[PDB]
Amino acid sequence: PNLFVALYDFVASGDNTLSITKGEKLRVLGYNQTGEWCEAQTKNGQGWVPSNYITPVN
């Protein structure tokens, strides 16, 4: 239930954010207080990405 796919490329902006590429899979650890940011893991590492830049995949 934690497997997601990226909707859009996102280039890290520092501050423990994680670059992700459209169509690539990621596993979600959780969210920040407002829900706007999502802490995720990919083959490239771990960090924060926008919550509405990702979606579940079976």
């Binding site: 940011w37 802490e39 926008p50 830049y53």
Partner: peptide, 10 residues
Amino acid sequence: APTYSPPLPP
């Protein structure tokens, strides 16, 4: 998480 909001979706 960052204290600033993320970028909006394209």
